[PDB]
Amino acid sequence: MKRTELDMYDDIFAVLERFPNVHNPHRVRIRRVGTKYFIEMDIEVDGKMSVKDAHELTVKIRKEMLKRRDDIEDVTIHVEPLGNVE
Amino acid sequence: MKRTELDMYDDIFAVLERFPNVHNPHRVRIRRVGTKYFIEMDIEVDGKMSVKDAHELTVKIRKEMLKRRDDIEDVTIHVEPLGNVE
Numbered sequence: 001m002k003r004t005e006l007d008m009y010d011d012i013f014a015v016l017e018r019f020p021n022v023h024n025p026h027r028v029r030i031r032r033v034g035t036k037y038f039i040e041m042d043i044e045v046d047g048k049m050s051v052k053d054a055h056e057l058t059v060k061i062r063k064e065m066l067k068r069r070d071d072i073e074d075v076t077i078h079v080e081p082l083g084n085v086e
Numbered sequence: 087m088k089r090t091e092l093d094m095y096d097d098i099f100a101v102l103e104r105f106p107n108v109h110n111p112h113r114v115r116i117r118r119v120g121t122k123y124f125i126e127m128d129i130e131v132d133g134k135m136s137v138k139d140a141h142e143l144t145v146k147i148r149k150e151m152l153k154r155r156d157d158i159e160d161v162t163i164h165v166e167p168l169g170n171v172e
Contacts, residue, residue, distance in 0.1 A: 047138035052167050054137050079165075081138050 005030070008069070012039060015064050021045055021057065023082060036073035039065060047081035054079045091116070094155070098125060101150050107131055107143065109168060122159035125151060133167035140165045 008030055016025050023044040031038040043061075045054055058077040065075045080086075094116055102111050109130040117124040129147075131140055144163040151161045166172075 045137055047136060047141075049137050050133060051131055051135050051137065051140050051165055052133035055133075055167050055170065079137055081141050084141065 008037065011068055012041070012065065015068050016043070016061070018064060019057065019061060021049065022061070027078075033073070035071060037069070037071055038073055039075040040078075041075075042078045042080055044080050044082050044084060094123065097154055098127070098151065101154050102129070102147070104150060105143065105147060107135065108147070113164075119159070121157060123155070123157055124159055125161040126164075127161075128164045128166055130166050130168050130170060 009028065012028060012030075013025065016022050026042050028041040029039070031040075043058075045057065049057075058079065061077055062075040065072055095114065098114060098116075099111065102108050112128050114127040115125070117126075129144075131143065135143075144165065147163055148161040151158055
């Protein structure tokens with residue numbers, strides 16, 4: 001770990017806190033490629049949430065991530081039920 | 087493309103046909119690493135399907151994939167709503 005690598009995790013977790021139905025963000029990983037960064041993560045949602053709603057959630061999360069940092073190129077979000085065993 | 091690369095896509099698509107609520111499998115990709123193969127795909131499900139049910143579906147699909155071919159090491163499945171715009 002280094003200080004710059006921390007600022008980024010702080011901003012990612014900072015954006016997720018905005019979303020009340022996002023739970024237990026984990027496997028949060030960053031890759032650097034030139035100027036721009038690629039972000040991947042798992043989130044948990046109520047098992048009763050529809051695929052429509054969960055998909056809309058990941059679209060809005062990526063949108064907010066890209067608005068926050070001008071150096072994030074893409075964000076991929078895997079959706080799991082609350083209390084998943086991978 | 088080569089003949090051996092076809093046999094594999096045939097077996098993957100052959101297993102998905104087993105599942106009636108799996109729709110429009112796409113971005114179906116194979117990576118070779120030594121003896122064993124890594125499979126990634128997108129599927130579409132009814133937007134009204136729960137995250138619990140969709141997750142259970144991907145678990146059963148991976149299980150059936152691994153049972154069919156002894157040379158598949160892992161299978162990751164992305165779930166989208168019917169008629170998704172990536």
